[PDB]
Amino acid sequence: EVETFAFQAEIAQLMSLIINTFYSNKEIFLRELISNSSDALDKIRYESLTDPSKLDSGKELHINLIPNKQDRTLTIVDTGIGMTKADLINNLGTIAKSGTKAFMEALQAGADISMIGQFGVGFYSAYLVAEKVTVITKHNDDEQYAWESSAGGSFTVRTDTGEPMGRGTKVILHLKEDQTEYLEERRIKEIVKKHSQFIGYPITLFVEKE
Ligand SMILES: COC(=O)c1c(O)cc(O)c(C(=O)OC)c1CCc1nccn1Cc1ccccc1
Ligand SMILES: [Mg+2]
Ligand SMILES: [Mg+2]
Ligand SMILES: [Mg+2]
Ligand SMILES: [Mg+2]
Ligand SMILES: [Mg+2]
Ligand SMILES: [Mg+2]
Question: Where, by residue number, does ATP bind?
Fold first, then answer.
């Protein structure tokens, strides 16, 4: 069973802006996704402060970056708090309608696209580099779900029967054919060093067989 939903008009507007605006500094997508992962890790950490059994689904708090040149995907995995089905439907746990408005008002007032994260909607910068994004997520006491969108005004949610994750979120970026530099080890390392060098969780960049 696959359910199909329409994006709210403001989010669809945001996504078509991101897809169609000429903007060369595309690398900021990775900073925004790692920062979102860090926020999700903070939240399961905080909750474990009073209920340590919330770490029963996995005690290790980390971020993995997995390039796959064969599939042309870059995947960002975290063991953060994850998302419920309701979270996914509510724009992946974001206040995206008010955030998009405040991002718009700021764009009109002398901001550039790189500030997107200050308005809570940094996730959508993924569409600077990805033609399709798949989000696999597992929250404690809910099932594992897969969210997906190639923009165009709609997204899908299904129960995920793939590899069970213990807890957390996997963002799978299906890269545009001209954006494969983000699969290169030295390029990913350069971006992480430039924009994410002080994140408070281990970031492991996986390598690939030649
Ligand atoms: C829309 O962002 C994400 O796609 C995203 C991510 O890339 C990595 C993640 O691990 C998570 C996650 O599962 O957060 C539970 C999300 C979705 C939630 C989210 N939306 C904006 C920021 N966040 C992270 C967050 C913020 C406040 C409290 C907890 C977590
Ligand atoms: Mg963030
Ligand atoms: Mg874990
Ligand atoms: Mg792989
Ligand atoms: Mg809102
Ligand atoms: Mg289903
Ligand atoms: Mg590494």
Answer: 36, 78, 97, 123
**Which technique was the structure solved with, according to the deposited record?**
X-ray
For residue 76, the SS3 value is strand
Q: Which of the listed residues 7, 14, 39 should we mutate to test ligand 1's pocket, taking the one with most ligand atoms within 8 A of CB?
A: 39
User: Starting from the edge strand earliest in sequence, which strands make up the sheet with 3-6, in order?
Assistant: 3-6, 154-159, 144-149, 130-138, 168-175, 73-78, 63-68, 203-205
To which residue do tokens 């600077």 refer? 128
3-state class of 45 per DSSP? helix
Could you tell me the two tokens for 203?
């970031």
Q: Are the beta carbons of 79 and 169 closer than 8 angstroms? A: no
Q: How far apart are CA 162 and CA 87, in angstroms?
A: 20
- State CA 182 to chain mean position distance: 15
Cα gap 41→26, rounded to integer Å: 25
How many domains are there within the chain?
1
Residue at token pair 């500094």: 25
Q: Which residue's alpha carbon is at the smallest distance from atom 9 of ligand 1?
A: 37
Q: Give me the resolution in angstroms, 1 decimal.
A: 1.9
Expressed as residue numbers, the domain containing 34 is: 1-210
Among 35, 92, 129, residue to substitute to test ligand 1 (most atoms within 8 Å of Cβ): 92
